[PDB]
Amino acid sequence: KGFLDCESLVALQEMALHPIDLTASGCLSEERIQKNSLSVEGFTYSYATERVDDRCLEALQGLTEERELIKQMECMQQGAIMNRIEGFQSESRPVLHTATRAWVRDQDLHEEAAAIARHSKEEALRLAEFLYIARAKFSTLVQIGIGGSELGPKAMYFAMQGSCPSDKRIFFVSNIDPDNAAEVLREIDLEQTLVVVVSKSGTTLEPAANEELFRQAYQNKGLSIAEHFVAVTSQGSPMDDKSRYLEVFHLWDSIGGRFSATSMVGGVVLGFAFGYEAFIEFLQGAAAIDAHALTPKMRENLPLLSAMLGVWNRNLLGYPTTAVIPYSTGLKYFTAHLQQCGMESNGKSISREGKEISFRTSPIIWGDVGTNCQHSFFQSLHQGTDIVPVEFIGFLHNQRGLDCVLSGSSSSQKLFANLVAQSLALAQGRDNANPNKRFKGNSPSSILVAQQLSPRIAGSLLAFYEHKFAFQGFCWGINSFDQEGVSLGKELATQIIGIMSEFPEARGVLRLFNVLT
Amino acid sequence: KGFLDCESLVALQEMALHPIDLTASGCLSEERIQKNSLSVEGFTYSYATERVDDRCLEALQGLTEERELIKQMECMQQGAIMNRIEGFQSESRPVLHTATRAWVRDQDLHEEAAAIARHSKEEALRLAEFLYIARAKFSTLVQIGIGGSELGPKAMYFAMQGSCPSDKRIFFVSNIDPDNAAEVLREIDLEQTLVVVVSKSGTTLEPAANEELFRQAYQNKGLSIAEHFVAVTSQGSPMDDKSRYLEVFHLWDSIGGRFSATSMVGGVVLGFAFGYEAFIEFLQGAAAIDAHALTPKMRENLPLLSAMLGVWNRNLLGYPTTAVIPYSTGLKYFTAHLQQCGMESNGKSISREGKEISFRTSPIIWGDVGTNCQHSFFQSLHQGTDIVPVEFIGFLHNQRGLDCVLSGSSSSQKLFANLVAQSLALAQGRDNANPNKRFKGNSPSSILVAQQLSPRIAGSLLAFYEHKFAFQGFCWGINSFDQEGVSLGKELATQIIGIMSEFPEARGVLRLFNVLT
Ligand SMILES: O=C[C@H](O)[C@@H](O)[C@H](O)[C@H](O)COP(=O)(O)O
Ligand SMILES: O=C[C@H](O)[C@@H](O)[C@H](O)[C@H](O)COP(=O)(O)O
């Protein structure tokens, strides 16, 4: 039964007419604050500030059943062909980023999923061997890569920077804009630098242009070049070449780029920065959420609940965006990665059966950290014309151990308290005789908290959102795991290269070129 | 005549029923590419890829007249009381960020505007005197401040980093999250560090907690403390204290935080990084756009056209967001600042007359750089269910002089060509027999280009968006220049401090606190 044809969706459309009024006096009771929460796998998740009541949550639970979300999650994790469009040409392959960490806890994986799990284990032990030497010889790592090859690793590197002692200097060169390469080359000692070229296909324009820029810089300084370059690419890729790289690590075709941070795409840079054992802790955190995401009761399942609350906000209440708001300096780059992972996966408008859909899929994912956000665009959340649902992320304790007692509390406490106060304020609002000072409220939010950001918790948070977006795709019935819009971008890049050294831009591009130059 | 009561808006509502079809064969003609462009003040602006035709642009021009946008811009720049709500308590003051740079070109300013202009000139010469010494004594500057006191300066600092030689190390400490302070303290030599505390009010929790954290670090290392701390604050503020700071610079009450990057809020950090003359070039670029924004014909006026095209997309076509996409590493932080400046200014739902409005104001402002964006959320722009209007920003040349010829073109060229190809692709789309590979098109965008990012161009780009948002506020008839939502945030912060050492969160905050800990 397709998305719109499920009985539970029909019930939810009636409920969406009159969602609970979070501004009614006494609505945010102790009972509701206790009931609408879940504490498991090192987190507490509170959603008393979402516009949901027990009737709504029973039907959302029915929706997960009618759409068989748990069965699809198993199928994905066990190795079924989830990346495909029936009736038409498509990639037609499994979706196996969970298998890149499944091997750190005993599991019964078969066929393609088992092969990915054992190859990941073989890669990781090759990484441990490699890092013993590399962390002794190099002070500096430069990751060349774009999209899924940069954002996940970069978000995870800054997430862990506060927990793991390290003297390594770490840079990311991604844009074909050569100013990106120049800013990094300005800063580094090449003799001390390990360059990690990360490209699944091995053929993306940006890593290839950037790698060539760095190869020339080594040759200009008169340094042996191959001794400094490591590749991370798909097996059998044009880049899978041990005569051109000091070492070569592999992912595989069933490892989506935007899901590859737990593969060697993240393993090399994270392992070099913080040491092997920290990367394993990161993997254990992800694998623990992989196992938890099979929990059948929505109310007892973090990614499944977050997915269905998102579906409530997006399709039933009609809000076209979601703001992710981490109260966490370490998570400064996490929203940018989530924005790719959610919008690239679920920014689709055809079903896995090839039919054009009549509902909306991925919302715009955007956001920034607190408390900074309270001084800027929170103005519009509190008093603008459009409701923006918020996902707050916070921690009870800082990573780096520096804090200060002022007026009876530490700044870690002030940080968390600000998050709580804003969620309550967004949900309840404030009357006022002055219209300039009134707050209508009923702007929904959830709160996810762990004790402290760590490698393990970073891994759990990553896997949490990976499965949230997968569950939303499974519910919508779309293919979350290809990206024909991004393939088109790479094809445009090939053609504009040929045009500057036929296709439907050419006549347009030429005339634009004349008016802009 | 209010927004909805203007005749031209009535005409535009009829036109919005059937906007031009950018996917119709031959629609993006040479005539249309020439006609729908504007090249002035060092930029070219192309909007042939917006869903507008001559009928629509004539009526939008009528809308600027009926709403008297040019007269309101003059009033703002000349010093009139634009920050006020009639009928109710409000801040009731002028809006004079333009006067902080007006003094670099001859002008006829009177009364409050003239006073701000001459005090800005007096501040700048005090800055030049100060920088001669400070750039000789310190290698490192740390800006402590949040919101308008950080984002604008930070966006401008990275914008200019590629053009101006500098050995200064520059950090921003903003969040009350003490991990922010800790990451910076981990990196700097305090004896070599100048700490610039930037806070207009002088009372915001975050700068005050952070300044105290840094004062203790100096005292722990046993260093003379006052010799290293500079203040930037409103005149007569609690911080305006030459016995507590090595030096004190001023802005004034009519200088909005989100418009303060051209005041000493940006002047100190920019002047220290790149030298005085670079800050003056930045001011000249802004002042040049201030003068240009008085041009009465919408089609001959960059910020007025961009504002009205935004109003077309937001209110007439109904798109609730705008993506700002800079093809520019130097502009990596520009979208975050624009997001504050637009959403905090225009995230309002009452008129300057105190009436609740019946239309939508600020959209969500979000985005990231190209070409990275082509590999991530551009998937949703090309094939998701919701139209997102795009503002592309690009340059013909890189800042840092490093580039490479590959297959007949430089990477600067590949960078620009990718931008052009994507705008055309978003507007025209692509049919396909395979539904997974078809692109519906008609997704609108504009293109703003300068020869090269520079201090001057950075200043023009900043002023461009400041006036875009002002023109949109003038058109909507809202007060763009206060922020009662942000005042509420600071009030919540005061109260949660007292609660941890009455108000409508208290009972809610306590029970949340129990469920999350
Ligand atoms: O799922 C991720 C997307 O396909 C995209 O972001 C991809 O990661 C980049 O285009 C880099 O691709 P390569 O790793 O193949 O260079
Ligand atoms: O217009 C800007 C806003 O009011 C807000 O972003 C403000 O800049 C910060 O709250 C910092 O305020 P202070 O500069 O007064 O510390």
User: What single string gives the DSSP state of each residue in A377-409?
Assistant: THHHHHHSSS---EEEEEEEE-SS----EETTE
The C-alpha atoms of residue A372 and residue A19 are separated, in whole angstroms, by 30
**A405-406 and A409-410: which strand pairing?**
antiparallel
* DSSP bridge partners of B439: B430
Helices (H), B330-483: 334-346, 378-383, 411-428, 455-476
**B390-397 and B445-452: which strand pairing?**
parallel
By C-alpha distance, which of B305, B307, B372, B385 is closest to B342? B307
* DSSP bridge partners of B322: B365
Residue A430 main-chain phi, psi, to 5 deg = -160, 120
CB atoms within 10 A of CB B405: 9
Amino acid residing at A342:
G
Angle among Cα A369, A374, A375 to the nearest 5 degrees reads 105
**A37-40 and A43-46: which strand pairing?**
antiparallel
The C-alpha atoms of residue B252 and residue A246 are separated, in whole angstroms, by 59
The C-alpha atoms of residue A138 and residue A129 are separated, in whole angstroms, by 15
Whether residue A486 has its Cβ less than 6 Å from ligand 1: yes
**A43-46 and A445-452: which strand pairing?**
antiparallel
Query: A292 near A40, Cβ under 8 Å?
Result: yes
* DSSP bridge partners of B170: B141
* DSSP bridge partners of A194: A141
- List the end-to-end C-alpha distance of chain B, in Å, as a whole number: 54
Amino acid residing at A119:
H
* A61, A311, A476 from A470: Cα distances, Å: 16, 12, 10
**Sole residue written with tokens 């609660």:** B499
* B45, B307, B308, B470 from B70: Cα distances, Å: 20, 12, 13, 11
H or E stretch at A216: helix A205-220
* A333, A336, A448, B311 from A324: Cα distances, Å: 11, 10, 11, 27
CA dihedral B126, B128, B132, B136 (to 10 degrees): 90
Radius of gyration of chain A (CA): 24
CB atoms within 10 A of CB B208: 18
By C-alpha distance, which of A10, A14, A19 is closest to A387? A19
Question: Chain B within 8 Å of A485 (Cβ-Cβ)?
Answer: yes
* DSSP bridge partners of A229: A195
The C-alpha atoms of residue B22 and residue B30 are separated, in whole angstroms, by 14
Q: How far is the CA of A148 from the centre of ligand 1 (A)?
A: 5
Query: A352 near A83, Cβ under 8 Å?
Result: no
The C-alpha atoms of residue A300 and residue A479 are separated, in whole angstroms, by 26
The C-alpha atoms of residue A263 and residue B339 are separated, in whole angstroms, by 34
Query: A476 near A357, Cβ under 8 Å?
Result: yes
Query: B385 near A361, Cβ under 8 Å?
Result: yes
CA B179 to chain centre: 26
* A262, A295, A327, B198, B255 from A40: Cα distances, Å: 22, 12, 20, 42, 48
The two most distant CA atoms of chain B are separated, in Å, by 75
| b/e sequence B446-473, b meaning 16+ C-beta within 10 Å | bbbbbebbbbbbbbbbbbbbbbbbbbbb
Amino acid residing at A17:
L
Instruction: Return the HEC string of A156-181.
Output: HHHHHCCCCCCCCEEEEECCCCHHHH
The C-alpha atoms of residue A305 and residue A293 are separated, in whole angstroms, by 10
The C-alpha atoms of residue B64 and residue B6 are separated, in whole angstroms, by 10
Q: Helix B178-185 crosses helix A411-428 at what angle (to 10 degrees)?
A: 140
Quote the tokens at residue B458. 């950075």
Decide: residue A405, CB within 10 A, 0-12 exposed, 13-18 middle, 19+ buried: exposed
CB atoms within 10 A of CB B186: 11
CB atoms within 10 A of CB A129: 12
Angle among Cα A439, A441, A445 to the nearest 5 degrees reads 135
Helix, strand, coil shares, percent, chain B, to 5: 50, 15, 35
| b/e sequence B108-145, b meaning 16+ C-beta within 10 Å | ebeebbbbbbebbeebbebbbebbeebbeebebbbbbb
Amino acid residing at B18:
H
Under CATH, domain B1-96+281-486 is a member of which superfamily? Glucose-6-phosphate isomerase like protein; domain 1 (3.40.50.10490)
User: Closest ligand to A257 CA?
Assistant: 1
Q: How far is the CA of B346 from the centre of ligand 2 (A)?
A: 16
The C-alpha atoms of residue B500 and residue B492 are separated, in whole angstroms, by 12
Quote the tokens at residue B498. 């007292």
The C-alpha atoms of residue B488 and residue B469 are separated, in whole angstroms, by 23
The C-alpha atoms of residue A54 and residue A140 are separated, in whole angstroms, by 53
Q: Is B397 a catalytic residue?
A: no
| Ligand 1, pocket-test mutation among A268, A483, A486, most atoms within 8 A of CB | A486
By C-alpha distance, which of A373, A399, A378 is closest to A388? A378
Radius of gyration of chain B (CA): 24
* A381, B111, B356, B468 from B85: Cα distances, Å: 20, 22, 12, 21
CB atoms within 10 A of CB B165: 7
Quote the tokens at residue B58. 């004539």
Amino acid residing at B319:
Y
The C-alpha atoms of residue A501 and residue A513 are separated, in whole angstroms, by 15
Q: Who's near A26: CB < 8 A, 6+ residues apart? A: none
Query: A261 near A153, Cβ under 8 Å?
Result: yes
Instruction: Show me where chain A is broken: residue before each gap, C-N > 2.5 A.
Output: 501
Question: Chain B within 8 Å of A508 (Cβ-Cβ)?
Answer: yes
The C-alpha atoms of residue A147 and residue B435 are separated, in whole angstroms, by 24
Amino acid residing at A111:
E
The C-alpha atoms of residue A193 and residue A86 are separated, in whole angstroms, by 47
By C-alpha distance, which of A383, A170, A143, A132 is closest to A277? A132
Instruction: Return the HEC string of B139-180.
Output: CEEEEECCHHHCHHHHHHHHHHCCCCCCCCEEEEECCCCHHH
Helices (H), B68-138: 69-78, 99-102, 111-137
Decide: residue B354, CB within 10 A, 0-12 exposed, 13-18 middle, 19+ buried: middle
The C-alpha atoms of residue B484 and residue A436 are separated, in whole angstroms, by 7
Query: A356 near B158, Cβ under 8 Å?
Result: no
Q: Is A397 a catalytic residue?
A: no
The approach used to solve this structure was X-ray
CB atoms within 10 A of CB B218: 19
Strand order in the sheet with A37-40: A37-40, A43-46, A445-452, A390-397, A321-326, A364-366
Experimental resolution (Å): 2.2
Query: B127 near B271, Cβ under 8 Å?
Result: yes
By C-alpha distance, which of A217, A513, A147 is closest to B403? A217
Angle among Cα A97, A241, B413 to the nearest 5 degrees reads 85
User: Which residue of chain B comes nearest to A483, CA vs CA?
Assistant: B379
The C-alpha atoms of residue A448 and residue A395 are separated, in whole angstroms, by 8
User: Closest ligand to A143 CA?
Assistant: 1
By C-alpha distance, which of B378, B345, B376, B381 is closest to B363? B345
3-state secondary structure at position A230: strand
3-state secondary structure at position A136: helix
H or E stretch at A339: helix A334-346
Size of chain B, expressed as the number of residues it contains: 517
* DSSP bridge partners of B169: B140
Tell me the shortest Cα–Cα distance from A510 to chain B, in angstroms.
Answer: 9
3-state secondary structure at position B49: coil
CA A368 to chain centre: 14
Question: Chain B within 8 Å of A497 (Cβ-Cβ)?
Answer: yes
Size of chain A, expressed as the number of residues it contains: 517
* A95, A366, B142, B144, B413 from B192: Cα distances, Å: 52, 37, 11, 16, 41
The C-alpha atoms of residue B26 and residue B208 are separated, in whole angstroms, by 60
Q: Give just the sign of the alpha carbon dihedral B182, B187, B191, B195.
A: negative
Decide: residue A221, CB within 10 A, 0-12 exposed, 13-18 middle, 19+ buried: exposed
By C-alpha distance, which of B452, B465, B393 is closest to B164? B452
Minimum-distance CB partner of A147 among B330, B362, B375: B375
Residue A169 main-chain phi, psi, to 5 deg = -100, 130
CA B8 to chain centre: 29
Cβ-based contacts under 8 A for chains A and B: 490
CB atoms within 10 A of CB B11: 17
* DSSP bridge partners of A406: A409
**Sole residue written with tokens 């070569």:** A248
Report DSSP letters for A263-308, one per residue: THHHHHHHHHHH-HHHHHHHHHHHHHHHHHTT-SSGGG-HHHHHHH
CB atoms within 10 A of CB B207: 28
Q: Which residues line ligand 2 (CB under 6 A)?
A: A 375-376; B 146-149, 199-201, 204, 207, 256-258, 483, 486
The C-alpha atoms of residue B352 and residue A72 are separated, in whole angstroms, by 53
Q: Who's near B303: CB < 8 A, 6+ residues apart? A: B289, B292, B293, B463, B464, B465, B466, B467, B468, B470, B471
Report DSSP letters for A17-76, one per residue: TS---TTSTT-S-HHHHHHSEEEETTEEEE-TTSS--HHHHHHHHHHHHHTTHHHHHHHH
- Judging contacts by C-beta atoms under 8 Å, the chain A residues touching residue B174 are 372
Where in chain A do CATH 3.40.50.10490 domains reside? 1-96+281-486
Q: Do A89 and B434 touch (CB under 8 A)?
A: yes
3-state secondary structure at position B391: strand
Query: B166 near A183, Cβ under 8 Å?
Result: no
Q: Is A375 a catalytic residue?
A: yes
3-state secondary structure at position A417: helix
In this structure, what DSSP letter does residue B225 have? Answer: S
Question: Chain A within 8 Å of B23 (Cβ-Cβ)?
Answer: no
Query: B327 near B370, Cβ under 8 Å?
Result: yes
The C-alpha atoms of residue B56 and residue B41 are separated, in whole angstroms, by 25
Quote the tokens at residue B6. 């203007």
Q: Give just the sign of the alpha carbon dihedral B446, B451, B452, B454.
A: negative
Q: Do B329 and A377 touch (CB under 8 A)?
A: no
Query: A357 near B324, Cβ under 8 Å?
Result: no
Query: A199 near B349, Cβ under 8 Å?
Result: no
**B445-452 and B43-46: which strand pairing?**
antiparallel
